[PDB]
Symmetry: C2
Amino acid sequence: VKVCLFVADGTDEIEFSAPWGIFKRAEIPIDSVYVGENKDRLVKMSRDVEMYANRSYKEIPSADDFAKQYDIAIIPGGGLGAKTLSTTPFVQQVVKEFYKKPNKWIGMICAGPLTAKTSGLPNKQITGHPSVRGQLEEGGYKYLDQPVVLEENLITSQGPGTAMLFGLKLLEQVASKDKYNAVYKSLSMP
Amino acid sequence: VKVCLFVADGTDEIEFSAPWGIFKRAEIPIDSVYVGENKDRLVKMSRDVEMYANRSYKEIPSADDFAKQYDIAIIPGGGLGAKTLSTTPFVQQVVKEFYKKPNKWIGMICAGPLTAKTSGLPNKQITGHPSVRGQLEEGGYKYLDQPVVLEENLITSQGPGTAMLFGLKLLEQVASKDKYNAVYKSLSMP
């Protein structure tokens, strides 16, 4: 299994770091894939961290090619970062391609779940940050107030406070029982 | 109030990002201050993120000068990062100077709390990652198996899973109840 963690200028640091650190501990390959223009793949995160991404999305010609490279696509939040990711045709295409595939999984957290709306996904239930609840309900979604929601192969989550639970829920779909339990135990979850 | 988040090569991404994002949301100034060899302030984090720190500690001419600049010192974990930070005299000097001083605060998470022993702090209790429990109790500290411990003005915490509770506990000491509650509410804590 290989994971793509999307990142844009304005992506939240907490929501990036949680799945990143969880999949690294699991020894499951994960790449950060930048949606933006900086030619060195240098990203300015939501709260001003400057960090390098592994790849640019420009390296991947299509969603069909993306699907041959990755099994999990993760769309983190942060207000600005989510606006960019949710409005990028490539990301929407990946989301549409992965939705309901038996060997693929999509995660969206915080304002990330706006990408379900923009990709036209027909899932019934969803969650996200309370600040985008109105926007999600306009689209026709049933907002649930809980840390993590799963519908088909789409996992959604609320906020920086739930980023660890969100990363774990993604890992749960792909890790063996023993790998999941070992990674979980290593985190000192409260 | 002005916070220093220490960072080294091998610092854990999750434990850096939680206090960082929390203090940023609180609109409390926070600098990342790198301890290491890289002259460009490029840090290779525990799980391979490459990120720029705002400052090098070599910009700050003494621990007394550090105390003139910062009110809170935070020591994140990650094996290698905590090994480096805990064994840097500048960091130990800052921790010693800040301990039990009015309106200063120290936080250490995961392996970070090894810095209490190397600095000779006379706190009675502590927590930290279960992986370092022995090494902590070897310094004469009583280990508490709970997410966060506060003793005098020293906050210690267990692991990546507790990084958000850790950042919050630091914030709680310095923000008004009103500000704290607003920041808390924004996080969607589970």
